[PDB]
Amino acid sequence: YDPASLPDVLPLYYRRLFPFYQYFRWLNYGGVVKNYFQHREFSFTLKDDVYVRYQSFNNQSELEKEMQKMCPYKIDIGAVYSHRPSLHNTVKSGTFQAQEKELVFDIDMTDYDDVRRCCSSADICPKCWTLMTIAVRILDRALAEDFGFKHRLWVYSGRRGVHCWVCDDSARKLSQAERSAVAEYLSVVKGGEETIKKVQLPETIHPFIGKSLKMVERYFEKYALVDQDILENKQCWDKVIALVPEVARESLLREFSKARSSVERWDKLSSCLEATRRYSNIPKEIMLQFCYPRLDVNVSKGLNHLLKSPFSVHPKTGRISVPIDCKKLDQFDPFSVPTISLICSELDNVRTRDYKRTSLAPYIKVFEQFLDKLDQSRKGE
Amino acid sequence: LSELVHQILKAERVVIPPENIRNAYNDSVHLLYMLENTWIDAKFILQIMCELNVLPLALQITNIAGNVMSRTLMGGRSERNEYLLLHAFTENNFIVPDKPVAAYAGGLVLEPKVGFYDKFILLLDFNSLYPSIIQEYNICFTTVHREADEIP
DNA sequence: TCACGCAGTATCCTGT
RNA sequence: GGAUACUGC
Ligand SMILES: Nc1nc2c(ncn2[C@H]2C[C@H](O)[C@@H](COP(=O)(O)OP(=O)(O)OP(=O)(O)O)O2)c(=O)[nH]1
Ligand SMILES: [Mg+2]
Ligand SMILES: [Mg+2]
Ligand SMILES: [Zn+2]
């Protein structure tokens, strides 16, 4: 993909591929609340990194128009305000307030850098994507069981991670404090680059942590012991040794000198820890420190946060921010995600059904199913 | 201005936040909207001026008193009466003073019988009380004998 | 360079 | 004791 080719393709996509009808269905939420779509904030990033916010639109036609006119490189969705953002200058000071917004989570592979060995920075590979695969299951289950949020849209971020939009009416009316509470409840791996032991579970395992460890276990052997090989050599297993009390460290080292496979080393570590009881949760702390999602509480706490819009185009990879089907999560491949160049090649190879002829169709289908569920909830209620 | 427009013209005026005028220099639509807001504010000011009859009333008051119109429209009461009496005295062959380079008892408020009354209450009020007192008893500079705090 | 009078009700505070 | 408001005429 040639990023110099981005300015050539962006218009066509925004003209014949961007799913505006479903997009308006989403952000309009069945028209129940008046001025809901009209008070939504958008922000655009144009060529040469020119940023504009407090953009609002009257209806789908105005949005389609101004978007096709601007051809933005980035589209971010923001809060629904007390008035129309376009007229925020006209609103008396203090009377312009963000009132409702989806509850959103951003999981970014870059935040896992201190604990992955295959890639670094913005590089991803099939060996590390399983971490995202774990996160979506660990988090989404909580959101479906502990909090009872029923309408959850998971979206690929385009490069390094995934976003989650929780759109239940209750989740859209949550205050800042309630959002911060939700984020802290879901958050376990606490600390920066200056801390080595980032998980310190108490004697009692809270049911949520038990279910997160249960989800982790299913994948741990493949991710950590086979793929990541977190015990390949001394430079790496020294870390895991650094994560357990010194008392057994020596006892482990000799054992790790006689083990040929990291699965064997894990068995040995588990046996040694079991023999050594307050430390019976130490293996769980290691698993969490290598597998549990990291959440930027600043992303989810603030109501006025602008997050990458679904079906955006990644300025560098060119991939489309496509929704991820929860059931088919295990089959999701971030490298097969349609790029803008591929879908423009597909478009120029054959009115409201043009996208069905591209590789974008199944993802718009997943989005349509999610919107159908939202409509059913709006009606039934 | 907002309250004045609300109370006189019976219309709603939008307010441009002070922090948004600077940011409005990012789109043609917003800048034109700002200019139109200024135009609408000017129109509101002119409409308020017309409604109260500020100008004709100022002219009438100035003619009655004898001051300059700008002084009348600057507000205040001392200058108007000053010029009224100046003209009155000069016309009648008098030498007016030289321009400068709770002090006494006022009205009487009867002690009320506080309560609720469900029958007709008749209010009797005097017409131009103090002016009529000045006329009736002939109270003036040239009539009362003052002496440079007792009632003359 | 300025600015009308007086009678009356309601609320709130007194460290360096 | 003082200070801050705004009604009446
Ligand atoms: N200095 C001064 N005196 C006033 C003012 N308003 C009222 N007064 C005094 C003088 C009036 O003669 C007296 C009587 O009050 P009123 O409201 O009944 O007015 P007045 O009787 O002069 O005329 P009216 O009953 O309205 O036909 O109160 C004022 O604004 N300034
Ligand atoms: Mg009277
Ligand atoms: Mg006293
Ligand atoms: Zn990798």
Side-chain angles (χ1 to χ4, degrees):
Chain A
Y1 158 79
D2 175 37
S5 299
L6 197 47
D8 289 332
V9 288
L10 285 186
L12 191 59
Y13 175 76
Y14 283 138
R15 179 170 197 167
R16 292 183 66 202
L17 282 174
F18 188 96
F20 285 105
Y21 172 66
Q22 297 84 342
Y23 203 75
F24 187 85
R25 281 179 64 190
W26 179 28
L27 301 180
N28 189 45
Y29 286 103
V32 296
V33 183
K34 311 173 185 176
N35 285 332
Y36 208 75
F37 174 88
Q38 287 74 30
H39 281 17
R40 179 72 76 160
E41 180 181 9
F42 289 80
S43 177
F44 293 147
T45 301
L46 308 168
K47 195 180 183 177
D48 306 314
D49 289 318
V50 178
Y51 182 79
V52 302
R53 58 175 300 197
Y54 301 115
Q55 306 290 116
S56 66
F57 309 109
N58 186 33
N59 65 28
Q60 168 171 357
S61 182
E62 192 175 0
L63 173 69
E64 296 191 7
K65 221 208 175 183
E66 282 295 334
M67 269 173 65
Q68 291 156 357
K69 183 182 172 181
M70 296 269 272
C71 295
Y73 281 72
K74 305 181 193 159
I75 306 175
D76 298 329
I77 305 178
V80 178
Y81 282 81
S82 52
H83 308 82
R84 309 162 73 91
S86 62
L87 303 166
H88 80 278
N89 298 338
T90 87
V91 184
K92 179 165 188 175
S93 186
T95 311
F96 190 61
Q97 293 175 17
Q99 285 183 345
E100 290 192 23
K101 191 181 87 82
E102 295 77 355
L103 165 67
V104 294
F105 300 94
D106 188 346
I107 323 185
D108 259 328
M109 198 68 75
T110 295
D111 293 331
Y112 294 71
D113 268 10
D114 53 320
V115 294
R116 56 163 179 166
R117 299 178 72 220
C118 48
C119 309
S120 57
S121 212
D123 269 329
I124 61 158
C125 77
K127 297 202 189 166
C128 45
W129 185 254
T130 312
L131 285 171
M132 290 298 124
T133 298
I134 290 163
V136 174
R137 289 175 107 85
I138 281 171
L139 272 166
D140 184 80
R141 185 216 61 79
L143 295 179
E145 299 183 5
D146 303 356
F147 287 100
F149 301 159
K150 283 151 197 188
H151 316 107
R152 311 175 306 281
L153 178 71
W154 288 88
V155 194
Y156 178 56
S157 80
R159 195 197 199 158
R160 282 147 44 199
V162 301
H163 299 163
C164 179
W165 298 78
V166 178
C167 309
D168 298 32
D169 184 67
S170 59
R172 304 194 301 270
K173 300 177 182 167
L174 290 175
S175 68
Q176 232 187 20
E178 296 163 353
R179 288 165 203 258
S180 192
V182 172
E184 297 174 36
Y185 173 96
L186 299 175
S187 278
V188 177
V189 181
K190 300 179 178 185
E193 254 180 0
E194 293 205 354
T195 281
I196 303 171
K197 205 211 205 326
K198 299 168 161 70
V199 183
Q200 184 176 273
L201 296 173
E203 218 191 357
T204 184
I205 300 295
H206 192 286
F208 164 81
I209 305 183
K211 302 178 191 180
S212 297
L213 278 153
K214 265 188 189 176
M215 292 296 181
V216 164
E217 280 168 0
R218 289 181 181 277
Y219 296 88
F220 188 76
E221 203 184 276
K222 191 175 177 179
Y223 161 75
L225 302 180
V226 174
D227 289 345
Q228 285 292 317
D229 201 340
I230 58 172
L231 294 164
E232 187 195 325
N233 47 59
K234 185 192 160 163
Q235 232 180 354
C236 55
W237 75 50
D238 279 342
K239 296 168 183 180
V240 181
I241 298 165
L243 311 182
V244 301
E246 298 176 327
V247 296
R249 281 188 186 172
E250 254 179 0
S251 176
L252 281 175
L253 275 170
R254 275 178 235 173
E255 290 296 345
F256 289 162
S257 297
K258 303 184 195 179
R260 280 188 185 180
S261 82
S262 287
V263 179
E264 279 174 4
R265 290 185 258 259
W266 183 247
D267 283 342
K268 288 254 181 179
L269 188 151
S270 294
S271 301
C272 182
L273 281 174
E274 254 176 1
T276 318
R277 204 252 313 170
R278 179 170 181 270
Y279 303 144
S280 70
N281 299 350
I282 294 200
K284 295 175 176 184
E285 295 179 345
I286 295 165
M287 292 165 73
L288 289 168
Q289 175 146 353
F290 281 96
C291 298
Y292 193 87
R294 288 100 155 113
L295 295 179
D296 189 351
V297 179
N298 287 328
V299 172
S300 309
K301 182 183 176 171
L303 260 165
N304 65 322
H305 183 71
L306 285 155
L307 181 66
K308 186 177 281 208
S309 175
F311 299 105
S312 297
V313 185
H314 198 283
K316 292 182 185 177
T317 71
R319 310 177 182 130
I320 301 298
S321 280
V322 292
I324 302 177
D325 179 17
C326 283
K327 305 296 186 177
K328 287 194 171 189
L329 187 73
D330 288 64
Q331 285 152 43
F332 181 81
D333 187 341
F335 302 99
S336 61
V337 166
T339 61
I340 184 176
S341 81
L342 192 77
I343 60 171
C344 286
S345 180
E346 294 178 327
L347 186 85
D348 290 4
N349 253 331
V350 289
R351 185 165 86 261
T352 71
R353 299 175 305 262
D354 272 322
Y355 70 81
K356 281 195 172 180
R357 287 184 179 79
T358 60
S359 285
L360 193 64
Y363 305 112
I364 295 166
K365 200 186 182 184
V366 177
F367 191 37
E368 274 160 352
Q369 282 173 359
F370 160 70
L371 290 177
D372 290 338
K373 273 184 186 178
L374 264 163
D375 287 308
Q376 279 174 2
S377 85
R378 275 190 296 267
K379 197 162 183 178
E381 270 186 0
Chain B
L1 181 63
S2 311
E3 180 53 31
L4 273 180
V5 167
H6 201 294
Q7 187 61 62
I8 292 160
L9 312 178
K10 313 147 155 153
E12 194 220 38
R13 156 163 131 79
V14 169
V15 170
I16 312 308
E19 299 178 356
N20 296 17
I21 279 165
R22 269 185 171 291
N23 202 1
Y25 285 94
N26 193 33
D27 198 359
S28 283
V29 177
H30 313 155
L31 194 58
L32 293 199
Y33 174 68
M34 161 185 316
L35 204 80
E36 202 68 17
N37 193 98
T38 315
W39 197 82
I40 297 150
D41 302 339
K43 208 177 63 35
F44 279 136
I45 277 166
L46 195 51
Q47 270 181 310
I48 296 158
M49 181 192 172
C50 284
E51 206 77 71
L52 301 166
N53 288 125
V54 174
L55 258 181
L57 205 75
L59 186 63
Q60 263 147 37
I61 275 155
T62 304
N63 271 326
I64 299 155
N67 59 340
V68 184
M69 207 164 152
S70 65
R71 281 301 323 221
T72 300
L73 282 170
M74 267 199 332
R77 304 278 169 185
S78 294
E79 182 62 289
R80 301 184 194 156
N81 172 46
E82 172 167 327
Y83 264 107
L84 206 166
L85 280 169
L86 270 166
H87 273 287
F89 278 112
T90 292
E91 288 181 344
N92 271 262
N93 206 16
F94 267 76
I95 290 172
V96 305
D98 299 306
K99 163 154 273 283
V101 73
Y104 61 112
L108 184 65
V109 188
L110 280 49
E111 212 141 32
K113 293 183 184 178
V114 310
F116 183 102
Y117 301 70
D118 61 348
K119 301 190 163 164
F120 287 128
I121 284 278
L122 177 79
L123 181 33
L124 288 156
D125 191 273
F126 272 102
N127 274 121
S128 294
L129 183 62
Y130 280 177
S132 310
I133 277 153
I134 293 165
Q135 296 176 63
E136 171 87 58
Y137 295 119
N138 206 18
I139 274 159
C140 183
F141 301 98
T142 73
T143 62
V144 160
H145 320 324
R146 313 170 286 290
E147 198 62 77
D149 181 8
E150 219 170 33
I151 305 298

Coordinates of all heavy atoms in Angstrom, one line a residue, chain B residues 104 125-133, chain C residues 4-6, chain D residues 8-9, ligand 1:
Chain B
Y104 N -33.2 65.9 56.6 CA -34.5 66.6 56.9 C -35.6 65.6 56.9 O -35.5 64.5 56.3 CB -34.8 67.8 56.0 CG -35.0 67.4 54.6 CD1 -36.2 67.6 54.0 CD2 -33.9 67.0 53.8 CE1 -36.4 67.3 52.6 CE2 -34.1 66.7 52.5 CZ -35.3 66.8 51.9 OH -35.5 66.5 50.6
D125 N -55.9 58.8 46.8 CA -54.5 59.3 46.6 C -54.6 60.7 46.1 O -55.5 61.1 45.4 CB -53.8 58.4 45.6 CG -52.3 58.8 45.5 OD1 -51.9 59.7 44.7 OD2 -51.5 58.1 46.2
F126 N -53.6 61.5 46.5 CA -53.5 62.9 46.1 C -52.9 63.0 44.7 O -52.0 62.2 44.4 CB -52.8 63.8 47.1 CG -53.6 64.3 48.2 CD1 -53.6 63.7 49.5 CD2 -54.4 65.4 48.0 CE1 -54.4 64.3 50.5 CE2 -55.2 66.0 49.0 CZ -55.2 65.4 50.2
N127 N -53.3 64.0 44.0 CA -52.8 64.2 42.6 C -51.7 65.3 42.7 O -51.9 66.4 43.1 CB -53.9 64.8 41.7 CG -54.8 63.7 41.1 OD1 -56.0 63.6 41.3 ND2 -54.1 62.8 40.3
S128 N -50.5 64.8 42.3 CA -49.3 65.7 42.3 C -49.2 66.4 43.6 O -49.2 67.6 43.7 CB -49.3 66.6 41.1 OG -49.3 66.0 39.9
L129 N -48.9 65.6 44.7 CA -49.0 66.1 46.0 C -48.0 67.3 46.2 O -48.5 68.4 46.5 CB -48.7 65.0 47.0 CG -48.8 65.5 48.5 CD1 -50.2 65.9 48.8 CD2 -48.4 64.4 49.5
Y130 N -46.7 67.0 46.1 CA -45.7 68.1 46.4 C -45.8 69.3 45.5 O -45.7 70.4 45.9 CB -44.3 67.5 46.5 CG -44.0 66.7 47.7 CD1 -42.8 66.1 47.9 CD2 -44.9 66.7 48.8 CE1 -42.4 65.4 49.0 CE2 -44.5 66.0 50.0 CZ -43.3 65.3 50.0 OH -43.0 64.6 51.2
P131 N -45.9 69.0 44.2 CA -46.1 70.2 43.3 C -47.3 71.0 43.6 O -47.3 72.2 43.6 CB -46.2 69.5 41.9 CG -45.4 68.3 42.0 CD -45.6 67.8 43.4
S132 N -48.4 70.3 44.0 CA -49.6 71.1 44.3 C -49.5 71.8 45.7 O -50.1 72.8 45.9 CB -50.8 70.1 44.4 OG -50.9 69.3 43.3
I133 N -48.6 71.3 46.6 CA -48.3 71.9 47.8 C -47.5 73.2 47.5 O -47.8 74.3 48.1 CB -47.6 71.0 48.8 CG1 -48.6 70.1 49.5 CG2 -46.7 71.8 49.8 CD1 -48.0 68.8 50.0
Chain C
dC4 P -29.2 62.9 39.5 OP1 -29.9 62.0 38.4 OP2 -28.8 64.3 39.1 O5' -30.0 62.8 40.8 C5' -29.6 63.5 41.9 C4' -30.7 64.2 42.7 O4' -31.9 64.2 41.8 C3' -31.2 63.5 43.9 O3' -30.4 63.9 45.0 C2' -32.6 64.0 44.0 C1' -33.1 64.2 42.6 N1 -33.9 63.0 42.1 C2 -35.2 62.8 42.7 O2 -35.6 63.6 43.5 N3 -35.9 61.8 42.2 C4 -35.4 60.9 41.3 N4 -36.2 59.9 40.9 C5 -34.1 61.1 40.7 C6 -33.4 62.2 41.2
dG5 P -30.3 63.0 46.3 OP1 -29.2 63.4 47.1 OP2 -30.3 61.6 45.9 O5' -31.6 63.3 47.1 C5' -31.9 64.6 47.6 C4' -33.2 64.7 48.3 O4' -34.3 64.4 47.4 C3' -33.4 63.6 49.4 O3' -32.9 64.1 50.6 C2' -35.0 63.5 49.4 C1' -35.4 63.7 48.0 N9 -35.6 62.5 47.2 C8 -34.8 61.9 46.3 N7 -35.3 60.8 45.8 C5 -36.6 60.7 46.4 C6 -37.6 59.7 46.2 O6 -37.5 58.8 45.5 N1 -38.7 60.0 47.0 C2 -38.8 61.1 47.9 N2 -39.9 61.1 48.5 N3 -37.9 62.0 48.0 C4 -36.8 61.7 47.3
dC6 P -32.3 63.1 51.7 OP1 -31.6 63.9 52.7 OP2 -31.6 62.0 51.0 O5' -33.7 62.5 52.4 C5' -34.7 63.4 52.9 C4' -35.9 62.6 53.2 O4' -36.4 61.9 51.9 C3' -35.8 61.5 54.2 O3' -36.9 61.5 55.1 C2' -35.7 60.2 53.4 C1' -36.5 60.5 52.2 N1 -36.1 59.7 51.0 C2 -36.9 58.7 50.6 O2 -37.9 58.4 51.2 N3 -36.6 57.9 49.5 C4 -35.4 58.2 48.9 N4 -35.1 57.5 47.8 C5 -34.6 59.3 49.2 C6 -35.0 60.0 50.3
Chain D
rG8 P -42.2 49.4 43.9 OP1 -43.4 48.7 43.4 OP2 -41.3 50.1 43.0 O5' -42.7 50.4 45.1 C5' -43.5 49.9 46.2 C4' -43.6 50.9 47.2 O4' -42.3 51.1 47.9 C3' -43.9 52.3 46.8 O3' -45.3 52.5 46.6 C2' -43.4 53.2 47.9 O2' -44.2 53.3 49.0 C1' -42.1 52.5 48.3 N9 -40.9 53.0 47.6 C8 -40.3 52.6 46.5 N7 -39.2 53.3 46.2 C5 -39.1 54.2 47.2 C6 -38.1 55.2 47.5 O6 -37.1 55.5 46.9 N1 -38.4 55.9 48.7 C2 -39.5 55.6 49.5 N2 -39.6 56.4 50.6 N3 -40.4 54.7 49.3 C4 -40.1 54.0 48.1
rC9 N1 -42.8 57.2 47.2 C2 -41.7 57.9 47.3 N3 -40.8 57.8 46.3 C4 -40.9 57.1 45.3 C5 -42.1 56.3 45.1 C6 -43.0 56.4 46.1 O2 -41.5 58.6 48.3 N4 -39.9 57.1 44.3 C1' -43.9 57.2 48.2 C2' -44.9 58.3 47.8 C3' -46.0 57.5 47.2 C4' -46.0 56.2 48.0 O4' -44.6 56.0 48.3 C5' -46.6 55.1 47.2 O5' -45.9 54.8 46.1 P -45.9 53.4 45.4 OP1 -47.3 53.0 45.2 OP2 -44.9 53.3 44.2
Ligands
LIG1 N1 -38.0 63.5 44.9 C1 -38.8 62.5 44.5 N2 -40.0 62.4 45.1 C2 -40.9 61.5 44.8 C3 -40.6 60.6 43.8 N3 -41.7 59.7 43.6 C4 -42.6 60.1 44.5 N4 -42.2 61.2 45.2 C5 -42.9 61.9 46.2 C6 -43.3 63.3 45.7 C7 -44.8 63.0 45.3 O1 -45.5 64.2 45.2 C8 -45.2 62.1 46.4 C9 -46.5 61.4 46.1 O2 -46.2 60.1 45.4 P1 -47.1 59.7 44.1 O3 -46.5 58.4 43.6 O4 -48.6 59.4 44.5 O5 -47.1 60.8 43.1 P2 -47.9 62.2 42.9 O6 -48.9 62.3 44.0 O7 -47.0 63.4 42.8 O8 -48.8 62.0 41.5 P3 -49.8 60.9 41.0 O9 -50.6 60.4 42.3 O10 -49.1 59.7 40.3 O11 -50.8 61.6 40.1 O12 -44.1 61.2 46.6 C10 -39.3 60.6 43.1 O13 -39.0 59.9 42.3 N5 -38.5 61.6 43.5

